[PDB]
Design brief:
The protein is of the alpha/beta class and about 260 residues long. The protein contains eleven helices and nine strands. The chain has a seven-stranded mixed sheet, sandwiched between helices. The chain has a two-stranded antiparallel ribbon with strand order 1-8. Helix 2 crosses helix 3 (about 50-55) and helix 5 (about 110-120) packs across helix 7 (about 150-160). The protein is elongated, with a radius of gyration of 21 Å. About 35% of the residues are buried. Its main location: cytoplasm.
């Protein structure tokens, strides 16, 4: 099986960490069920997760930037009808997928946050299940008042219910990577962007060493108006941004309406 991987590669001529362990595949696919809409996978690689998905009866469009893997993917998915697209993941037209679609994917570190933020803002998906480097998972699912908490945690919570389901070790892949990976499931609520809310949240976390009062003041918020907003909401004068959950940021936004 690691030899089978190596032979496959050598057969076709061939830089990445391919997700390969059949046992871990079960759980990702299970995590994605039910398949109530079509499924989009980024980075099929050798096609191992694509295979498990197709055999589970998902209808899969797999989007692969490396055309050199087309023969590989053809060989590995034979018997299974799939749509293969060769395109950069962030340039694929995500705003055009069927409403109700799912993402199920092993995501490269560099693409994961931009791609998930983009998909959440479309408001178009039923469910996003993906593997990501653990530290990216912790931000997406962080608790207030921990170092992984920040804008990204609040972006995800605004759009979706977020779960970190389990970690996967390097032996899940070949070659094995030098990081822990995590399987995240996000379940969109149907909430779309709130650009005004996210201007406030970005400013709040802008000056990470200050009270929220003084970080907002440094972003241009009129200072006495912020002291008033915080005290009417019953917050400590010296409260920090990482202490506010999404509800508190909403209530703060309403109290600062027009500030601007």
């Amino acid at each position: 099986s690691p030899q089978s991987v190596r032979a496959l590669l050598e057969r076709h001529g061939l830089g990445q960490n391919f997700l390969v362990s059949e046992a871990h595949l079960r759980r990702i696919v299970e995590a994605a069920r039910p398949f109530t809409g079509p499924v989009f996978e980024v980075g099929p690689g050798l096609g191992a997760l694509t295979r498990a998905l197709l055999e589970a009866g998902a209808e899969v469009t797999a989007i692969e930037k490396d055309l050199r893997l087309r023969p590989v993917l053809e060989e590995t998915l034979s018997g299974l009808p799939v749509r293969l697209v060769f395109q950069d993941a962030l340039l694929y037209p995500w705003e055009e997928v069927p409403q109700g679609s799912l993402l199920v994917a092993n995501l490269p570190y560099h693409i994961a946050t931009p791609l998930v933020t983009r998909l959440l803002k479309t408001g178009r998906f039923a469910r996003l299940v993906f593997l990501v480097q653990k530290e990216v998972a912790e931000r997406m699912t962080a608790r207030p008042k921990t170092p992984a908490y920040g804008v990204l945690t609040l972006r995800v919570a605004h759009h979706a219910v977020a779960e970190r389901l389990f970690d996967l070790p390097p032996g899940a892949f070949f070659p094995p990577p030098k990081v822990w990976s995590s399987l995240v499931r996000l379940t969109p609520t149907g909430a779309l962007d709130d650009p005004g809310l996210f201007r406030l949240v970005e400013a709040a976390f802008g000056k990470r060493r200050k009270t929220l009062l003084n970080a907002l003041a440094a972003a241009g918020y009129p200072k006495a108006r912020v002291e008033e907003a915080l005290r009417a909401l019953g917050l400590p004068p010296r409260v920090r941004a990482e202490e506010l959950d999404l509800e508190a940021f909403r209530r703060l936004r309403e109290g600062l309406e027009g500030a601007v």
